[PDB]
Design a protein around this ligand. Sequence first.
Ligand SMILES: Cc1cc2nc3c(=O)[nH]c(=O)nc-3n(C[C@H](O)[C@H](O)[C@H](O)COP(=O)(O)OP(=O)(O)OC[C@H]3O[C@@H](n4cnc5c(N)ncnc54)[C@H](O)[C@@H]3O)c2cc1C
Ligand SMILES: Cc1cc2nc3c(=O)[nH]c(=O)nc-3n(C[C@H](O)[C@H](O)[C@H](O)COP(=O)(O)OP(=O)(O)OC[C@H]3O[C@@H](n4cnc5c(N)ncnc54)[C@H](O)[C@@H]3O)c2cc1C
Lengths: 458, 458
Amino acid sequence: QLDPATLAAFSAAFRGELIWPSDADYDEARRIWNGTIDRRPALIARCTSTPDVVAAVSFARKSGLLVAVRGGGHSMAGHSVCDGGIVIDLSLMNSIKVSRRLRRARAQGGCLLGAFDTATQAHMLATPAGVVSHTGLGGLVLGGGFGWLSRKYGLSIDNLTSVEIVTADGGVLTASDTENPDLFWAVRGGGGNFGVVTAFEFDLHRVGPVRFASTYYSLDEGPQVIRAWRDHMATAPDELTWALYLRLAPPLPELPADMHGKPVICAMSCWIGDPHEGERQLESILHAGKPHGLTKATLPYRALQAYSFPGAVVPDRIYTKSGYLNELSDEATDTVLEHAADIASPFTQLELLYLGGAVARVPDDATAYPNRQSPFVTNLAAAWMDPTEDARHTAWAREGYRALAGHLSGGYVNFMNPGEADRTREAYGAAKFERLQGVKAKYDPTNLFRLNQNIPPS
Amino acid sequence: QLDPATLAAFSAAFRGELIWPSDADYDEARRIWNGTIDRRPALIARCTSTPDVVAAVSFARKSGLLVAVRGGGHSMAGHSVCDGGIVIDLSLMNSIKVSRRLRRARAQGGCLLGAFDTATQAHMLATPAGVVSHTGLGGLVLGGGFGWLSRKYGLSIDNLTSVEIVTADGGVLTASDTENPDLFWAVRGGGGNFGVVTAFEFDLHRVGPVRFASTYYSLDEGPQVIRAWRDHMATAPDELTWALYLRLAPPLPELPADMHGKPVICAMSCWIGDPHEGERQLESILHAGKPHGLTKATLPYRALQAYSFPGAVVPDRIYTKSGYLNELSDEATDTVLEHAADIASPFTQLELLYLGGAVARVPDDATAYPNRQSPFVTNLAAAWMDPTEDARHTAWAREGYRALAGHLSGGYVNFMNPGEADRTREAYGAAKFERLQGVKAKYDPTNLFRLNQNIPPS
Ligand SMILES: Cc1cc2nc3c(=O)[nH]c(=O)nc-3n(C[C@H](O)[C@H](O)[C@H](O)COP(=O)(O)OP(=O)(O)OC[C@H]3O[C@@H](n4cnc5c(N)ncnc54)[C@H](O)[C@@H]3O)c2cc1C
Ligand SMILES: Cc1cc2nc3c(=O)[nH]c(=O)nc-3n(C[C@H](O)[C@H](O)[C@H](O)COP(=O)(O)OP(=O)(O)OC[C@H]3O[C@@H](n4cnc5c(N)ncnc54)[C@H](O)[C@@H]3O)c2cc1C
């Protein structure tokens, strides 16, 4: 319960919409993508402008309210909603300005990937981001951001040229390579630790149609397929991206009925470049095993972005355990296949991703993002509907991770689950974590922004 | 040259960006999708809120500035930019609020379709809109709006429940079936004639993955493909949509190279419903000729929306002639094939669309959209790059229209070209036009909003 004068100053300054626990849309406004997170904020402030975010940060600081910031609400740790605090909700700040001649996009901090991609593709332009359209740009970029265009053009942060950011003191700063470069280093991988980003500026690239393929392999052939994949990606051109999703086969017409619901490897691949070269490149990796349900298409980049994932179903409840690998040993390969064979929910995926390429050619210390030199990512992404089955699916992800943990290092902060606060130092490493703390001490000394993979100051 | 106190009142009330002819970004900001339209506004006002729009509409009325209103900039007539007037540019008002429980979306007037579909598809929901993601939602909906979901769920306006609209006098109104219903009737098909819509409210539908097919037929087999189409679509269930696009075959690896750049029928089809039924239904319509470069996929609806058109090239210069047909005779089929054989630009399409279904079940006078009872639309959509070639592409469109004029009636206001201001009466018909003139006399009696398929008051 709040100070009336502080609240009245807030209401007069704030031009967005405020949602209170008694309002009709409070229950839908406080849900985030991870539906296991059920929390009740004192206030949700739907900002519509940078002055709105200023007023909301300042109101929160003066009132002592625990601050959650929300872009697209996809935090796998549930950081975008809080008990008893204020949600600074950016979802209505979804505007993008694209300059075709300059190959530049300026995107507000609340954009969804699909809105961003629609705007840039109006000019046949693009820049790297994640693979599911309704993910928020904000959290994704601040953690690094990888997807289809990343082996060719780097992480999202490798194309970021500046931000507008509201800091804990209510100030509005620009951070770039020429202005507050210490803060600009930190926001490229350091998350929401340093303030609320209200606008991102990106360099764009011309991206025409891309040759794309998706197919399914039986777990029978898993050893030969995963070994073909890790061997080929070690020397693959930047232009090829190839990812493996172990999952239950979806009940789709392109798959034989006897495969529906059983563990398979879903392989998805694309060529960023000439589609005829892409057709030759993909044809040579599609037959590592017998391809079932093969879909080949020459897609506009916006449609590639909208494709993931097959079955198009939004799960209510999720739990993720992830790490990087420097090498994918045969022992790690067998472990991945044994646990994939035990997947229970049709929405769970054991993801095997290969980064590298342009991501790995950026010097390690040039941004806050850790583990550019590890090309493999494995993600035990459990997802289900029924809340009484939480233990089944959570246990699957935990046991898989534990059996792999010796082969893993680091961790992508954007794949951390609600119980992985203690993983922050191991994810960043000692040198980056220490540098991040010094930037935290300068820009957020009270740790007002602590609903994130948190960096304590000093 | 403007009255300096009306100017300063406006700038004080306006919290958005103003672009003047001397500013560096003026030339990029004044371009619209139809690059044959080259106009120089006195002022571009980039609105960020409904009060911004109120200030701009009032400033234009007080100053006598000619008003262009801009959503997504896709006017085939060039109406979203003006010489010497003001552009009320809505492109930054791109926010969408979605209720999963109530299956409702509220979208601002500047949204692009792809941003809208991303936000609704985050909940596996959708509502009918156009087929190209970067089209503006504003002008599309005010004209009617049809696309992949229309045979199943109707026009965009058929799912619209209310608008917030800024009228010529500067007031903000709600318009619905229970509040200002004469205005609500008129904005569902009447264009921007009655004010600036700053928010649309839509009913949503659950749309999971849809089975989709695109393929290409030789003109050799042209007559039997088009007759199969027009025969099948007369009795096809609502769940099937099947459209034909006669064009030069794009140079894509799924097509043999000997077909590249030569006239073909591009056939695109989808089933809105169970994908296994969809696979049977599409296969039953795919083989009236030999299908070259066949792509079949089970796509999330958002990826279907992002798919058009194959080759993903944005043309610089366009010219369109369109009308409705009540029937497609063999004689008209021959004319369409003859004219398609003469297509010169790789970006031109002679489109043959079939609406009907749920569109035709809405009583004719329920909205201002005309010609629900004509199921065929043909669109001679010329598009090219080289400005020295305008005459030839323009001529193709008009010669083709004139050769089909015995079969064509009415006309979609959203497909009309810059020289077609005279066609407004024929498009709506005398009775609808008369009623529209009465709503205009009430809400825009000075015809402040005249850059549209214009309806003069009285
Ligand atoms: C279905 C799905 C697919 C994904 N795919 C990918 C992928 O392909 N690649 C990838 O790299 N990641 C991917 N992710 C992970 C994604 O990067 C993270 O979940 C990210 O945190 C999501 O950001 P958000 O704004 O949507 O989330 P939120 O829950 O809104 O926010 C996440 C964190 O960022 C902070 N934050 C958000 N916006 C801002 C802002 N404007 N300013 C300051 N702080 C902010 C929040 O405080 C919180 O700490 C995926 C996640 C999901 C659920
Ligand atoms: C590539 C392409 C694909 C298309 N596909 C389809 C399709 O599948 N189906 C279909 O039905 N049509 C389609 N169209 C046509 C489309 O409906 C019209 O071009 C429409 O006018 C585009 O709206 P806009 O806001 O993008 O255009 P703009 O140029 O911004 O505006 C068009 C008109 O509407 C007015 N206007 C725009 N927004 C508002 C608003 N918020 N309030 C008041 N007036 C407003 C403008 O004053 C102008 O008169 C397509 C067009 C293109 C170029």
